[PDB]
Amino acid sequence: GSSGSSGPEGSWDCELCLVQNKADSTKCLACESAKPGTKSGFKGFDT
């Protein structure tokens, strides 16, 4: 559900060096790369 769900939530696992990182942190620590994410402002069909 919403609270307590099966699966690691929060921390984001890196792909470049394949090393775990802190949620708050935006970039990696081992490779110092840019965390995979999207741009600000949701997208969709609107007028």
The annotation places the binding site at 14, 17, 28, 31
Determine how many CB atoms are found less than 10 A away from the CB of residue 29: 13
Write out the E strands in the chain: none
Q: How many residues bind Zn ion (CB under 5 A)?
A: 8
Query: Which residues from 1-47 bind Zn ion, rule CB under 5 A?
Result: 14, 16-17, 19, 28, 30-31, 33
Residue among 8 and 44 whose Cβ is closer to Zn ion: 8
* Dihedral angle over CA of 9, 13, 36, 24, nearest 10: 60
Q: Can you give the binding site for Zn ion, defined by CB under 5 A?
A: 14, 16-17, 19, 28, 30-31, 33
